[PDB]
Symmetry: D2
Subunit: 115 residues, 4 copies
Amino acid sequence: CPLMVKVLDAVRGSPAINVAVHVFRKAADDTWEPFASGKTSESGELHGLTTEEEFVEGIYKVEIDTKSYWKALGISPFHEHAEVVFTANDSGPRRYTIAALLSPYSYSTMAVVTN
Amino acid sequence: CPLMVKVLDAVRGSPAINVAVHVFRKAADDTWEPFASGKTSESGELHGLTTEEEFVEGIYKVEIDTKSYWKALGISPFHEHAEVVFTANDSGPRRYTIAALLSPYSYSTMAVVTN
Amino acid sequence: CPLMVKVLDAVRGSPAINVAVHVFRKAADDTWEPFASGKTSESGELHGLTTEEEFVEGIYKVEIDTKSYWKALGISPFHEHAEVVFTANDSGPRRYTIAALLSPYSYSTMAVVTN
Amino acid sequence: CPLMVKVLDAVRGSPAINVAVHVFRKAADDTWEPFASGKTSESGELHGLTTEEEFVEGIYKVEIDTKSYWKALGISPFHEHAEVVFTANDSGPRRYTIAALLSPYSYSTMAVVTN
C-alpha cells in the first residue's frame, strides 16, 4: 500500500466515515487524469488506492469531498473540497499517508512519508 | 477589500513574505479562469486582489505557491501548493480572509467570513 | 503591546468573541503566578495584557478558556482549555502574537514572534 | 488500551520518535498528580499508558516534551511543551487517541473518541 488517505472530523472527535476521495495524476498535456478513488471506511481510512507498480513518479492530487460530508451532517461548510497536491519521488523505498483533519471553516493536512 | 490572503510560516514563527498567490474563478464551461494574483507583503498579507464590483458570486480557487517559498529557504517540501476552493457571495456580498499556516509537510487553512 | 492573543472559531468561520484568557508567569519556587487576564474582543483579539517594562524574561503560560466558549454555543467540547507555554524575551524583548484556531475536538496554536 | 498518544513531525513528514510524554490526573487538592509516562515508539505512538480499571472519570493532562525533541534536531522551538487537558467521561464504552502535529512555532492537537 504505497498511498493511504486518513480523514478525521474535529467537530465530532471521530473518523470521517464515507467521505469520497478522488486521486488524479498530472498528464503530459497538463490536465488532471483520474487515477484512483474510494470512500473512507469506518476508521476514516482509505486503503488499496494503488500499487507499487502503478504509483510511479509524477504529480498527484488527492481531492477529499468535504462539502458533501458536512452537508450530510447538516453543518454549513466553507470549502468545496480539501485538495492535496504533491510530487511522488523515488528517493529509495517510500509509503505516503495523507491525513486531513476537518472542521467546517478550516482543514489541516499532513503527509507522513516513510521508508 | 472583500478578499484578503494571510500566510504564516510555522518553522520561523513569522509572516511568510513574498509568497505568490493566484486566484481563479470557475467559468460557465467548468474551467478555471485567472481572476487575480499577487505576492504577500512583509506582514504576510495580500490585500487589493479584487473589488466589491468584480467579486461576484462564483466558485473561487486560491492557490498559494508554498513549494517556491520553501525552496527559497532551502527546504524541499511535500506539497506543490496550498489550494483553497470555495463558493463565494452566494447569500450576498461577504468579506473573506483566507489564512494559511505553513510547515514543510503540513498546512492548515482557515477562512474568516464577515458580513 | 508586547503580547497579544487572537482566537478564531473554525466551526463558525469567525473570531471567537468573549473568550477568557489567563496568563501566568513561572515564579522562582516553580509555581505559576497570575500575570494578566482578559477577554477577547469582537475581532477575537486581546490587547493590553502587559507592558514592555512588566513583561520581563521568564516562562509564561497562556490559558485560553475554550470549554466555557463552546458550552455557551451549546457544544460539549473535548478540551478544558488550550494552553500555550513558552520562554519569553530570553534574547531580548520581543513582540508575541499567540493565535489559536478552535474546533470542538481539536485546536491549533501558532506564535508570531517579531523583533 | 483506553488512552493512546500519537505524535507527528511536520518539518520531517514523519512520526516524532522518542518524544517524552507525561500524563497527570487532577487530585482533590487541585494539584496535578503523575499518572503515567513513556516515550513514543518508531511509529510515533505511545501505547499501554493505562488500563480500563485505572482510567476512571477525572481531569487529565497529557504533557508532550516538544522542546527536547526540537533541540535534539538542532531546531529553535517556541513552546516548552504541548499540553492537552481534558475530562474523561463514562458515557458508554470509550477509547481516546490524543494526536499532536508538531512544528517549531505551532502545534495542532486532535482527540479521536470512539466506542
